[PDB]
Design a protein around this ligand. Structure first.
Ligand SMILES: O=c1ccn([C@@H]2O[C@H](COP(=O)(O)OP(=O)(O)O)[C@@H](O)[C@H]2O)c(=O)[nH]1
Length: 434
């Protein structure tokens, strides 16, 4: 097997939407014959028992922490508090097995791994877990400031169709200058690696593919969708599947806003009443930590909601999302348009309604609704009226046919001969050549 005898160390950023593709990549590479060490902070640490073919080294992260505000601060804090323990753990790993790490594969957001890799003389490959389209925005961010797109709504960003100003990637309560600093750091430490892995396919990116290559001085591998590649479900996850088994085919709206976005009580109430008033069956994930600054207890739902929706809805703290999405009862997906959830909806043929919040979410949601046209976007603060219109519109009536095509195209790119199967074999060769 091609990689046997080659030790790769993969470094995810410690949140689920980053851990998940890094470890899909990990399992894929292990199946190509590599030995895989994951190094991870204790923060949101994955379960080793779900990845029995991977070796796990857990490091102290020196920290709770809010994930929906002050995002540049949090992400700089993750880099900083983990850096010294990472350095010492990598050095101990080399010393403790002089019998050698071939490569470091690092989340693009962990820009601290560049200095670490240079000091250890190790080659780096950067994994970008956001949408490849969003990279184009990050790369030309100061140019978008130049042309007066930023700061600040529906004006077409002509350089980046179909994006509007309001779709450009950003973080709450954050100035253009802070955005330019941060994005330029991630862009630079991606461009300084030996290669960049993108979690998408040649076909999904066809409209921008030439442009993408030109924004990187280094080779690019389109190995996704990586989700197309556990050992025990929690109580909340297993109830998801048992409840769906009772529901009519394609009748369920699955609702989940990822692992890190946040809401206040009032937005959650509008969600809830919009959901209830739409009268659609729904599986709603309200993760611990979604709702901030409230004084009420999980699931923070308005009084009367459970009563009005008994029989129609199921509320949980976590869902086995990928199994939920291929489940025959699931007919739509209200997402925040995180890239993993976008891909997972595409791979499952499930039309989506998008309420993006920050980062590439706003890019992805516009792509879902305008470019791939496999779903719709809620524009805006959530308001129950507009939400119910969106949910009834999603679950009624074509979009499904385009979603079916996209799904089939994703199946074909990952099998033998597919562009992503090819691209992963070139990646393996790039790794072996280092
Ligand atoms: O109840 C949930 C919610 C999310 N996810 C997974 O968490 C990840 C979230 O990544 P995404 O890019 O969608 O958003 P992020 O969480 O990074 O904002 C995806 O792989 C989802 O399948 C899950 O397994 N269960």
């Amino acid at each position: 097997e091609q990689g046997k005898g080659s030790h790769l160390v993969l470094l995810p950023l410690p949140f689920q939407g980053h851990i998940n593709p890094m470890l899909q990549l990990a399992n894929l590479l292990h199946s190509k014959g590599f030995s895989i060490t994951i190094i991870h902070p204790q923060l949101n640490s994955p379960n080793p028992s779900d990845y029995p073919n991977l070796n796990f080294e857990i490091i102290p992260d020196g920290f709770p922490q809010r994930t929906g505000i002050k995002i540049i601060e949090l992400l700089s804090a993750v880099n900083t508090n983990c850096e010294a323990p990472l350095r010492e753990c990598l050095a101990r790993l080399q010393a403790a097995n002089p019998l050698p790490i071939s490569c470091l594969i690092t989340d693009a957001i962990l820009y601290s791994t560049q200095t670490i890799a240079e000091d250890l003389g190790l080659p780096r490959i950067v994994l970008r877990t956001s949408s490849p389209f969003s990279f184009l925005a990050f790369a030309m961010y100061s140019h978008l400031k130049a042309k007066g797109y930023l700061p600040i709504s529906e004006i077409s960003v002509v350089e980046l169709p179909p994006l509007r100003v309001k779709d450009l990637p950003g973080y709450p309560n954050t100035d253009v200058n802070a955005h330019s600093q941060f994005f330029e750091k991630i862009v630079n430490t991606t461009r300084s690696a030996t290669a960049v892995i993108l979690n998408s396919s040649d076909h999904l990116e066809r409209a921008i593919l030439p442009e993408l290559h030109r924004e990187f001085p280094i080779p690019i591998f389109f190995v996704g969708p990586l989700c197309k590649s556990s050992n025990r479900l929690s109580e909340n996850e297993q109830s998801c599947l048992d409840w769906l088994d009772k529901q009519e085919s394609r009748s369920v709206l699955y609702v989940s806003f990822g692992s890190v976005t946040e809401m206040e009580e009032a937005d959650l109430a509008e969600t809830a009443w919009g959901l209830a008033n739409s009268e659609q069956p729904f599986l709603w994930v309200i993760r611990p930590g979604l709702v901030t600054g409230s004084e009420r207890t999980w699931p923070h739902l308005p009084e009367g909601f459970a009563e009005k929706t008994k029989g129609k809805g199921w509320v949980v703290k976590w869902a086995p999302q990928q199994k939920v999405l291929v489940h025959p009862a699931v007919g739509g997906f209200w997402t925040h348009a995180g890239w993993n959830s976008t891909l997972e909806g595409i791979c499952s043929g499930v039309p989506m309604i998008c309420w993006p919040r920050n980062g590439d979410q706003t890019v992805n949601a516009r792509l879902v609704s305008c470019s791939w046209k496999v779903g719709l976007q809620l524009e805006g603060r959530l308001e129950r009226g507009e939400i119910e219109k969106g949910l009834r519109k999603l679950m009624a009536d074509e979009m499904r046919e385009r979603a079916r095509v996209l799904k089939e195209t994703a199946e074909l790119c990952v099998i033998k001969g597919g562009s992503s199967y090819v691209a992963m074999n070139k990646l393996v060769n790039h790794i072996l050549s280092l």
